[PDB]
């Protein structure tokens, strides 16, 4: 591993 | 637009209803929420000018916390011309004397303070129930179990019902716990504990008029991925901490008092060892939750915590143990940072290094959190943004605050827009990372947020309720909400319209959280519809149900003087008495509680004690009591312990240890009782 | 005359205890001792009440202690 | 004769620091540097001392790791106070304080406290 | 002085100091009964002996042999000790023992020191009866081992104090430890007063009261007290102790000067300079507040002068 | 401030027994001067009037 | 509200007239010993009072 796995740069705010 | 706030039509209607009949006031957040209470208090202000002896009534404003009590006190001082007093335990209220206590009751027409202070005040006959006019209970939801509100209002059963003042159930939320199942019976119990029914908004234009103050903010879900793999260093620090835990369980510090469970069934480690174990366990929790860089910040905080504890420690063994803990904290920090820095050779720009480690030495939770920050407050007006961060634990506040400071300095865009701040409730922690032995910034965090100095407030369930704050622009709920009332008040914190209310949840745990969200929404809708359709013009409980709601507990003992020994306060009274007995710093010792074994219980109390618990108490040797009081057999450990405390307090009162006001006798009282016997001849010279 | 004032193994049993237990060691209350007990140190007389005052102090303290304990 | 104003404040602080140090025998910061940053104190030692310390910490010619640890620490002029600490453990619980401009005390058994400081230095300098 | 305690008791009710009771005439007050249920004489001796290990060694060091050991158990039980359920703490017995010891000491010094004047007489009385002298006596006779107590702080202080006394040979000297300038060599003379535990003196006084209550012969109690205090009785008469600030101020040739207290953190620094054997000497005292620092500086000064006389 | 020249010498006369107290007072004064200067350097206000 | 110079250029310009002096301390051997004549005058003055 050695790293924290990255995430997307374009998540959104979802009406819930 | 007037300096004097104008009472509204709906507010006046509610005040008139409360004048006709007491009850619970359920209103959304706003200044009018307290304005209605101020108006009700002003309504019954006729008898304030008259003296207490002539029947001149007074106003009592009982509160849950000191801060909101201060807020209500200053509000009623600014909105009314009546004399109002502020009374919290930290002001030294108890050392006051009957004479000046009475003349300050005369001076201050309105009394505001915490629940316990007023409970003690009424139990000690400083004010009679007939001497009060209105008793306001803000945060009405806090009437759970043996909370001071509930026992105080149980105390109403003693005096004549005709003398009882008007109670006002001010609240912003009705459900307190996760009691969604059959909300109707819970609110029925609440409105029997309180002596009036709930009143709220029902008409459409009534709701709009409330919206003249209150708002209906929206909520948005933000979700992040999770993964179970962990780094090698995580395991290395884990193993080192476990070895230190072993060496600490085998530390063998000096003799310490025996610590046992709440039910006295099992033993516990000494407080000195439990404290450091708690510190390290919380550090591991922060490490696994918020990333390794967050772990570096948490370990930095542990450095100053161990430094101050070592500085203030006295026993040489405790000194050495703290020194070892700090040394291992340094070693753990060194392994962490050396792992960080060997990877931190691809780039050397400290801004870029800080951003890279915040992006990649951190869990996806913090990554998505900071991404929400950057997409929300990239280059906006710093005055425009005003947001709260809600976290679980106290140390999470410092961890997040430091990480966000370092990210603000690691973000040129966010460099000057965001001003973070943290504060936590009791068990307060040194709010720094540098062991700054002296600071002059006397302005508190709440004042900084109120004046706009800090546009971000990071807190662990301390800003969620009671505190007076502006209409916050946004709210970030970092950790999942555990309780209905917590969710309601958190969503109420984003009191501005078109606000952003974020629920940070895992991608893999969407279903349970969303079902919880529908459960809370269903509970709120059930509360609304119940308050709409369910109504009775009786509006007040009957005598039989009033007594039924409180006949379960042990009857309190009342003297002809008028004082009442509350069974739930028996332990507090007894432990206060044991505090005052020793005349030496090393002589202090708490009573030795004990639970009798079944064979012992039988051979002492016959077969009648079968199926019931018994708790014995042995007084400290220096005390005059040495009779080993035995509690009455009761169903559970807590009931038996309360009964033992109550019986011991009754015995102490009988043997003259208590002054018939159930407080331990002071030295002045003893010497005054002896004055006539031994110092009577001073009278002829006009002295005593 | 009080020359003490500047302006001019078997333990030995205490005399006070000896005359407390027995009656044959009793001594009369001297006139000069009473006069010394009356003569304050403010007056320039050759004797003062201080030395008797110490023993009176200890006796009074002991008797008050025993009375309170009883 | 005349005396300068700063050299005397440097002496009053020396007074109080000396009293603090003699009173408890430690817990007074002689690094005097950034409170976070004193963690790097061992990393900032002189290159030749660190070089010989690393040579000894990776050495195996020393037939036991005890005198190995002594050589590694003596490369840095350290002074150990190995002492027994009262414990419920059958095997005695041992204490060691290394002394520096910084305070470092380690807990382990006599069977592994020397290893527990060897790997400590290994962490510090690598 | 002329009619003994039996008769002397009556003038208190004559002076209306106390109030007479029908059952308790004042002349019988020497027959002090330890009444009440705080004390229980029904306990078998083996239960007390369970607490009282090395009983014979303690009686040998004390010089008295008890015939009712329960009083000894009351005197040895510090109030922090929870597992004693048959007696009260030593506070009750210490209260009586203080008066008993003070009265007997005053009577002895009155009888045997008519030469030395009243002011120095009361100075000697105060110096001999004070807490620290009783604590040093308790240490010197190894009585501290038998104190029944459960408290880390008190035990730590007792151990430190007994180690200091052993380093001093159990003599009653100035209670000060010098840190710099065997003390290590340095450049600055620094000193701090030694902390004395009140428990040692209080338990010794309660033990004296227990001896009285067991024997009822005041002469026996005086025998024990003299056997304990004989070396310090012999030493104090030659040089009456006075508070060290005055002892240095009143000194013939020291001529001390005391600096203003300097505060840094919570420790307080006071310096004292004095001539000594044609050489000027400056010593620095530290304490939790100004007066303790001044006491430590004065004590260090007195130690320096006493050793410089030779 | 009265010593208005280059290479002005400002002399204080203090007793040996009062030296350390005077030193603490003087450095407390210097710290106060530095902190008030820093406060005026740092503070930002909007109205510039009470 | 207080106004003051704040620029570093203003800082280095203020030295034009704000020249500060080097401050130094002289210690003297404090001693209480004095000849009897001062005590004699003290006695005369108190008697006259």
Numbering used by the authors:
A (entry chain B): 344 to 359
B (entry chain A): 2 to 689
C (entry chain A): 1035 to 1042, 1169 to 1230
D (entry chain C): 186 to 311
E (entry chain A): 1379 to 1559, 1594 to 1722
F (entry chain D): 493 to 542
G (entry chain D): 198 to 246
Text from the published report:
In Drosophila melanogaster, Dicer-2 (DmDcr-2)-mediated RNAi pathway plays important roles in defending against viral infections and protecting genome integrity. During the maturation of siRNAs, two cofactors can regulate DmDcr-2’s functions: Loqs-PD that is required for dsRNA processing, and R2D2 that is essential for the subsequent loading of siRNAs into effector Ago2 to form RISC complexes. Here we present several cryo-EM structures of DmDcr-2/R2D2/Loqs-PD complex bound to dsRNAs with various lengths by the Helicase domain. These structures revealed that R2D2 and Loqs-PD can bind to different regions of DmDcr-2 without interfering with each other.
In order to investigate the effects on DmDcr-2’s function in the ternary complex during siRNA generation, we constructed the DmDcr-2 mutant (D1217N/D1476N, DmDcr-2DDNN) which exhibited no RNA dicing activity but possessed helicase activity in this work. To mimic the substrates and products, we designed and transcribed two dsRNAs, one with a length of 50 bp and the other with a length of 19 bp. From the 50-bp complex dataset, we acquired two structures: one in the dimer state with two DmDcr-2 molecules at a resolution of 3.72 Å, and another in the trimer state with three DmDcr-2 molecules at a resolution of 3.74 Å. In the dimer state structure, the model of dsRNA could be well fitted into the continuous density; however, compared with free dsRNA, we observed significant distortion. The 1st and 2nd DmDcr-2 are linked by this dsRNA, and there are large angles of tilt and twist between the two Helicase domains. This decoration pattern along dsRNA suggests that DmDcr-2’s Helicase domain can adopt a head-to-tail arrangement. Interestingly, when R2D2 was introduced into the same system, the arrangement of the two DmDcr-2 monomers transitioned to a head-to-tail configuration. This indicates that R2D2 plays a distinct role from Loqs-PD in the complex, as it can alter the aggregation mode of DmDcr-2. While dsRNA played a supportive role in the dimeric state, the DmDcr-2 monomers in the trimeric state exhibited much closer proximity to each other.
